[PDB]
Chains A and B, each alone.
With several copies, the nearest count.
Chain A
Amino acid sequence: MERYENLFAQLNDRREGAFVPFVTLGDPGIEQSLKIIDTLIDAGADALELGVPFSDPLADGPTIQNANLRAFAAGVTPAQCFEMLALIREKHPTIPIGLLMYANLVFNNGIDAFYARCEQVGVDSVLVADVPVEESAPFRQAALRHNIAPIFICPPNADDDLLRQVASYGRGYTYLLSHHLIEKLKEYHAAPALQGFGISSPEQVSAAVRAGAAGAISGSAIVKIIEKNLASPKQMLAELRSFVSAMKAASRA
């Protein structure tokens, strides 16, 4: 599988950017999370970034910390996250699915076994939030051995060595934090850039693509709609569908 490569080639043919929502697996429960993910896809998500609930989500802001807490209140575990992932791939065969993980959850039962499990359920990429490129060797090797793309964050201040490492070591896409960087990454033949962090309106999706990014990632904005509508699951889905549709339309040429 080369799901990201296939996706970007098709989007390029259409002069279109990717729109990629982020949500937490099992927020606010397993069945509703499965419905939410299907709604994001039916509304036009090009790819998914999915978090696995972790006790100490250091690199996440309050909205996403709260999502993890909701998922823990439902008794969600990594094992149940992987059963969910298998069902999602079985329903949607071509959509790229990326995980946002913390290092402990990857390392816990053995790094290789983790990436093997990802391959078995049909995940395409993994971003390990708290592994910097300088210490990523065992992660990215294991990823690649299991046909999993290792994803790296490229910070807005990145120096030249860091840009070269990111361009060399990453695959699938480059996670670019919210025009110089975009051109350098392209210069160094990096995986295509997706812009993430604080993307919450259609206007920011268009702006990212116009700057030369291949697409945009949005999470807080999406998970906010979850949090806001806990009492009304059916309205939750309707609001998610509206927001994703609008955001995806902004990526179209």
Chain B
Amino acid sequence: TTLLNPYFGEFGGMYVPQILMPALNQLEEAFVSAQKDPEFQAQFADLLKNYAGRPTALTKCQNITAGTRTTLYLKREDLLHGGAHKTNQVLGQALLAKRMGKSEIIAETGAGQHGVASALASALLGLKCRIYMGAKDVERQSPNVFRMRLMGAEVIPVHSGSATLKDACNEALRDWSGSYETAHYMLGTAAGPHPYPTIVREFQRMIGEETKAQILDKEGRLPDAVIACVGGGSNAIGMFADFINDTSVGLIGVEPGGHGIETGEHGAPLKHGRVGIYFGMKAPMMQTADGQIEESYSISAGLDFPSVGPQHAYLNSIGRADYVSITDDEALEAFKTLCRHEGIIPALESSHALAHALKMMREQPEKEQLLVVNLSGRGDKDIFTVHDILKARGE
């Protein structure tokens, strides 16, 4: 028995070994209790406001849209403490851990952003944090590893399997199955077994709530569409949640197309993968024909989770949300465009969302449309990546 529905249509569930069920059931009951507790809500709101800097701005981009009938606003998650939206949910999850009497946090990380987010929340809230990161990722993400260690987190390199994100996830879950009485597993996206897709959405939903209020204040009506990149699904579901019932508002999720869908080198499982069961859930994933789990490829390492949150798969299935993809080259062009024309350096993750809005505008420049892009993070972290590409091909 669960308190809440673990599925979104056919997708989701709790496909974990039997021994991990009590941890998931404990978490779910703690969450349900927390959600009804005005003191928990007040404490979470207080951290978001006075520590993380909520509400975040909603910035109009007239320099980009000039001469078209597009109006473009960026939801400025790049201005959140830590430089990406991940901070919102790690703070709620850390509060949940304290609610349950846990004194330790376990987290996984691929590109290091969730690792840093978990570490900063743990440092603030006095939790002992240990982070599993694939040894190959540890090597290609030294700035993020040193941030984690500065913040008092223990960073544990994982050598098992392919020494990347999947292996980190597995090691985190293994640890948790033996330590859940004193440790909380701080999963970094709106995916994995129930209750994590639900929890992470609820702890990100202020993105869309604020966006709604701000767009109503500034324009007097809802957006025609809100657009967000999709790696695992957290920033997109946070933007989308409050608009789901506003049936005239388009929900566009943007997966990484990498070098191009046709090349096979992409990270677009929702639209170009196949449903499997892994990561504790039933969802579209990147996998071989005989069912071995594969990798997602993107210029942006933050978009490389090889599946997708089950609520996204469900929202696509019923036609409520539409999913598209953007290539590396398109994302790079959006990155350069925002730097040059608005003085904002976007994360390469976020640049995928922006690239698709640019496409919406440029393809039909006399179409009246009011767009919000979720600018999920800032791109200081990506400047050497972008520099080296722009160098490699002349410039």
Contact present between A and B (CB < 8 A): yes
* Chain A residues close to B by CB (< 8 Å): 54-56, 58-59, 62, 65, 69, 77-79, 102-105, 107-109, 129-135, 152-155, 157, 162, 177
B162 to chain A, nearest CB (A): 8
Is A56 a contact partner of B293 (Cβ separation < 8 A)? yes
Q: In whole angstroms, how far apart are the Cα atoms of A73 and B267 in the complex?
A: 26
Which residues on the A side are within 8 Å of B276 (C-beta)?
104, 107-108
Contacts of B173 in A (CB 8 A): 58
Q: Which residues of B contact A162 (CB under 8 A)?
A: 18
Nearest-CB residue, chain B, relative to A106: B277
Contact of B277 among A69, A104, A133, A154 (CB under 8 A): A104
Which of chain B's residues has its CB closest to A175's CB?
B18
Q: Are A129 and B17 in touch, CB under 8 angstroms?
A: yes
Known: A130-B15, A157-B22. 4 other contacts (CB 8 A): A55-B161, A56-B167, A56-B278, A104-B287
Q: Chain B residues near A59: list those with CB within 8 A.
A: 17
Q: Once the chains are docked, how many angstroms separate the CA of A133 from the CA of B22?
A: 12
Q: Given A104-B277, A105-B291 in contact, is the A58-B174 Cβ separation under 8 Å?
A: yes
Q: Give the docked Cα–Cα distance between A112 and B12 (Å).
A: 20
Contact A56 B166 (CB under 8 A): yes
Residues of B within 8 A of A135 (CB): 13-15
Q: Are B161 and A103 in contact (CB under 8 A)?
A: no
User: Beyond A132-B18, A153-B18, is A56–B170 a contact (Cβ under 8 Å)?
Assistant: yes
State A152–B17 Cα separation when bound (angstroms).
Answer: 10
Query: Does B293 lie within 8 Å of A130, measured CB to CB?
Result: no
Tell me whether B280 is interfacial, beta carbon within 8 Å. yes
Let me know if A62 and B21 touch, CB within 8 A. no
List the B side residues contacting A104 at CB < 8 Å.
276-278, 287, 291, 293
Q: List 30 A-B contacts (CB under 8 A).
A: A55-B166, A55-B292, A56-B161, A56-B166, A56-B167, A56-B170, A58-B170, A59-B17, A62-B160, A69-B161, A78-B290, A78-B291, A102-B278, A103-B15, A104-B277, A104-B287, A105-B290, A107-B291, A108-B276, A108-B291, A109-B291, A130-B16, A132-B18, A132-B20, A134-B21, A135-B13, A135-B14, A153-B17, A153-B18, A155-B19
How many of chain B's residues touch chain A, expressed as a range?
Answer: 20 to 34
Q: Which residues of B3-32 have CB atoms within 8 Å of chain A's CB atoms?
A: 13-22
A206 vs chain B, min Cβ distance (A): 26
- In whole angstroms, what is the CA distance A133 to B335 when docked? 48
In the complex, which residue of chain A has the Cβ closest to the Cβ of B293? Answer: A55
Q: Residue A130 contacts which of B17, B291, B292 (CB distance < 8 angstroms)?
A: B17
Nearest CB on B from A222, distance (A): 20
Say yes or no: A131 contacts B15, CB within 8 Å.
yes
Contact B21 A132 (CB under 8 A): yes
Residue of B nearest to A153 (CB): B18
Nearest CB to that of A61 among chain B residues? B174
Q: Kindly list chain B residues whose C-beta atoms are within 8 Å of the C-beta of A152.
A: 18
Task: Compute how far the CA of A109 lies from the CA of B170 in the bound complex, rounded to whole angstroms.
Answer: 24
How far is B1's CA from A152's CA once the two chains are assembled, in angstroms?
18
Smallest distance from the beta carbon of B177 to chain A beta carbons, Å? 9
**Chain A residue nearest in CB terms to B159:** A62
Closest chain A residue, CB of each to CB of B177: A59
Nearest 8 pairs of A and B residues by beta carbon:
A108-B291, A103-B277, A55-B292, A153-B18, A55-B293, A59-B17, A104-B276, A104-B291
Report the minimal beta-carbon distance from B296 to chain A, rounded to whole angstroms. 14
Query: Would you give the 0/1 interface string for B259-291, flagging 1 where the beta carbon is closer than 8 Å to chain A?
Result: 000000000000000001110101000010011
What is the bound-complex CA distance between A238 and B13, given in angstroms?
Answer: 45
Across-interface contacts of B278 in A (CB, < 8 A): 56, 102-104
- Chain A nearest CB from B146 CB (Å) reads 28
Q: Tell me which of A55, A69, A129, A153 has the highest count of chain B C-beta atoms within 10 A of its own C-beta.
A: A55
How far in angstroms is the closest Cβ of chain A from B26? Answer: 12
CB proximity to A under 8 Å, residues B157-193:
160-161, 166-167, 170, 173-174
Q: Which residues of A contact B21 (CB under 8 A)?
A: 132, 134
A contact residues around B287 at 8 Å (CB): 104, 108
- Asked if A153 and B19 make an inter-chain contact with CB atoms under 8 angstroms apart, the answer reads yes
Report A24 CB to chain B, min CB distance, Å: 15
| Complex CA–CA separation, A133 to B174 (angstroms) | 19
| Distance between A36 CB and nearest chain B CB, rounded to angstroms | 23
Are A65 and B17 in touch, CB under 8 angstroms? no
Report Cα–Cα, A81/B293, bound state, in Å. 18
* Contact between chains at A77 and B161 (CB < 8 Å): no
